[PDB]
């Protein structure tokens, strides 16, 4: 078996899911809210 | 110039007094130049050969020991002192020239003083 960190380093992921308990993200590619 | 000993006798008295004060401690005039005063001196001192810097440091230690003891050099030692034999001024001038050349062409300084 391969540990999760090694797999993450070896396999770039363009479909990243961020934690959503405190904040919900804007849709990807949205204009910045600066 | 008025600071020329050969042309001006006041400069002759000044040079004689400075030489006599330096000779009492075995110090060269270039030994008064402190690396902590400017980074140009520090760089010039770092470019000098090791034996010269060791001789400078030994003279500084001897002078500090004399000053702490309220003593001067013995007259036999004072007779062999060369207070105005230079080892630093040419290298300092070269470092200054290189610094100015860097500034004229818009390059970053090779070293800078820390803000206290």
């Amino acid at each position: 078996e391969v540990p999760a960190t090694v797999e993450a380093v070896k396999t770039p992921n363009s479909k990243i899911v961020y934690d959503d308990h405190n904040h919900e993200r804007y849709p990807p590619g949205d204009p910045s809210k600066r | 110039r008025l600071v020329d000993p050969r042309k001006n006798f006041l400069a002759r008295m000044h040079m004689k007094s400075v030489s006599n004060r330096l000779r009492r401690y075995g110090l060269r005039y270039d030994d008064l130049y402190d690396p902590l005063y400017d980074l140009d001196i520090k760089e010039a001192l770092n470019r000098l050969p090791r034996e010269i810097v060791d001789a400078r440091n030994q003279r500084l230690m001897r002078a500090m020991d004399l000053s702490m003891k309220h003593e001067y050099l013995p007259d036999n030692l004072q007779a062999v002192q060369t207070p105005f034999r230079s080892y630093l001024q040419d290298m300092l001038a070269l470092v200054k020239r290189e610094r100015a050349e860097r500034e004229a062409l818009g390059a970053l300084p090779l070293y800078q003083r820390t803000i206290p």
Binding site: - | N46, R47, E98, E101, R102, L105, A107
Partner: protein, 450 residues
């Protein structure tokens, strides 16, 4: 402005070059002091100008160990006329690039820029080699970065082994390391570098080769800066004797390496050099650490045998290092720390196999075509063209045409390959191993295989 898919309006377009341009002819002018200036006009808008010196580590013995590579690092530093800072700024003002290379028998200094900047390039290059200031702080900095350049040497097994078997294969000047030990560097300084350079950098030992400039302009700029150089009578390069030898550094661990080498003729002797090059192509091989791109040597004897019949092999190929009067032909190898004996057996068997005559005409034509295409393709580059001009005028003074080399390649039969390989392996071998050498066989056992 306008998008890059639309042509820019109001641009003055220069007339196009002809689809067939007549090649130019090398002009070689010799100065009374013995300095030779060569150039060829080129259609592309790039100029490559170099200075080539027949100095190297074969002149360090006995009191200048490490001087050549230090001089390589000290290239294009402060001169008597310009500071390092000013020289870097002049090179960058015209978009130039500098380079220096140090070898056992040659050093070079090159600058590359657009051909409109030839006077600046020539001026900066000669100031650099004629007037080094050799300031102590600059030498000390280049000596600290020499320690790293020598410590990271163990990270390249091929290079490390190559130097090591040069040391273990000769006795005289050729045995002097091209990467001096750390003890040998605590003696080097600016005075030593000046004394070494003044002795060896003479006009009759130096060539100014410029690919991509008219000879008139190059002469006009370079003549007033090199004639002052005095006439120094032509000495003789020292003699080196090829012997046998073994190199062994038992470091332990894993990933052993080796290189078995033999002696071959030098650049002088112009039918057998070729026999060595075509042999190197015939054995061929590859690094076995990466893949990609057919036709790089996947179907040579070394590759097709080792990497397609015996697994667990990390590297296997052939090398060549020819000097003026001698050379080194050998075979690399990585294998596995306990598979080392089998690996050396395989390599020796392959040398013996081509020695006997077990190679068919198809492989001979394949290697012959590989040799010819490798030589013709490597001349696509302007840099290589200039360097070849300089090296050949230093060695022969003529710049022999490539056509003569092409005929020698196409005059090679199997009987030649057979007799040359038989002669090469009938002489003492140079063995070198690096890594875990405990399981690696002795020198006598490997020598008895041939």
């Amino acid at each position: 402005l306008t998008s890059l898919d639309m042509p820019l309006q109001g641009v003055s377009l220069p007339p196009p070059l002809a689809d067939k341009v007549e090649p130019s002819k090398l002009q070689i002018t010799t100065l009374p002091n013995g300095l030779k200036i060569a150039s060829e006009t080129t259609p592309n808008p790039a100029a490559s100008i170099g200075l080539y010196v027949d100095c190297g580590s074969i002149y360090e013995a006995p009191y200048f160990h490490g001087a050549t590579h230090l001089l390589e690092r000290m290239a294009f530093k402060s001169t008597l006329n310009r500071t390092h800072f000013r020289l870097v700024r002049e090179i960058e003002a015209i978009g130039g690039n500098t380079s220096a290379s140090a070898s056992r028998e040659q050093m070079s200094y090159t600058i590359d820029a657009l051909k409109t900047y030839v006077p600046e390039m020539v001026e900066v290059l000669i100031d650099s080699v004629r007037n080094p200031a050799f300031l102590d702080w600059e030498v000390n900095e280049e000596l600290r970065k020499m320690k790293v350049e020598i410590a990271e040497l163990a990270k390249n097994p091929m290079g490390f082994l190559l130097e090591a078997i040069h040391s273990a294969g000769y006795s005289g000047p050729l045995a002097s390391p091209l990467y001096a030990p750390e003890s040998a560097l605590d003696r080097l300084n600016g005075e030593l570098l000046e004394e070494f350079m003044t002795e060896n950098f003479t006009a009759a030992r130096m060539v100014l080769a410029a690919s991509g400039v008219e000879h008139e302009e190059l002469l006009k700029v370079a003549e007033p800066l090199t004639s002052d150089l005095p006439n120094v009578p032509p000495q003789l390069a020292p003699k080196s004797q090829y012997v046998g030898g073994d190199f062994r550094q038992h470091t332990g661990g894993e990933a052993t390496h080796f290189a078995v080498a033999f002696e071959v003729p030098g650049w002088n002797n112009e039918k057998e050099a070729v026999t060595a090059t075509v042999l190197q192509m015939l054995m061929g091989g590859g690094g076995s650490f990466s893949a990609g791109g057919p036709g790089k040597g996947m179907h040579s004897w070394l590759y097709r045998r080792v990497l397609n019949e015996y697994q667990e092999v990390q590297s296997c190929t052939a090398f060549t290092s020819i000097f003026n009067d001698t050379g080194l032909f050998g075979i690399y190898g990585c294998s596995s720390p306990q598979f080392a004996a089998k690996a050396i057996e395989l390599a020796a068997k392959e040398l013996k196999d081509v020695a006997g005559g077990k190679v068919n005409q198809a492989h001979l034509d394949r290697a012959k075509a590989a040799t010819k295409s490798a030589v013709l393709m490597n001349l696509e580059s302007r840099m290589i063209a200039a360097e070849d001009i300089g090296r050949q005028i230093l060695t022969y003074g003529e710049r022999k045409p490539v056509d003569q080399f092409l005929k020698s390649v196409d005059q090679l039969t199997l009987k030649d390959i057979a007799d040359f390989t038989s002669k090469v392996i009938s002489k003492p071998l140079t063995m070198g191993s690096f890594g875990d050498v405990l399981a690696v066989p002795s020198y006598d056992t490997i020598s008895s295989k041939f």
